[PDB]
């Protein structure tokens, strides 16, 4: 998995 913003990437 997740970004620094906690999005799945």
């Amino acid at each position, epitope marked *: 998995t*997740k*970004d*620094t*913003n*906690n*999005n799945l990437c």
Partner: antibody
Amino acid sequence: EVNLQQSGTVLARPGASVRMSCKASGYSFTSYWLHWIKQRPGQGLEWIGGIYPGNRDTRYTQRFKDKAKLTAVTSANTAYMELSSLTNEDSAVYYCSIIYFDYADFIMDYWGQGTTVTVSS
Amino acid sequence: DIVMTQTPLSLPVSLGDKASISCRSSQALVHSNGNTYLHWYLQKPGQSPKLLIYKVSNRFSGVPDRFSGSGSGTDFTLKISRVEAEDLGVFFCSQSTHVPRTFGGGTKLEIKR
């Protein structure tokens, strides 16, 4: 569930440094990034950086690159932010924040009460 | 820093009326995972921001239906179908699909009586 407790008001002297905390509960402290944001009396909101307690990996913006230091003691679900060489611009309120939107049955977006810092002599 | 521009900056309204806040970003907010992480917050004086709508059109738990969200790519709108007296404060649109996560300057909603 899920709340963030931030340390209380802090009075600091110019050139000095302050260490403030944010204790979390309600979610897996070691599986999401935790953010810190600054807000001046008049101004809007600005993101300082974040930390991934799981592996202590951090992230900052060029501005706070040498102004802020982030750490976290996972055995206590607590995070820390340290501001060095204080000035009048450092005087503001700081919030730790958690957001997460990829699981519908568990949407997160919470803020500590914020920690108001006053830099004065 | 993908810039967020809100307009208007001040919003005079009378109870019952409808209101609209426009939010625009310097770059697309469509993340590679496919979602668009544009959100709207409301901050009463003396408190931390409170989420109203996440991912452009999703109302957060406990937020009145009077609030709606629309937008695509770079152009986004927050709508207050009916303005009560609680809606007092400053509204912020925000982006979290890019790093750093940014906020708009905000729109202070003023009531006319």
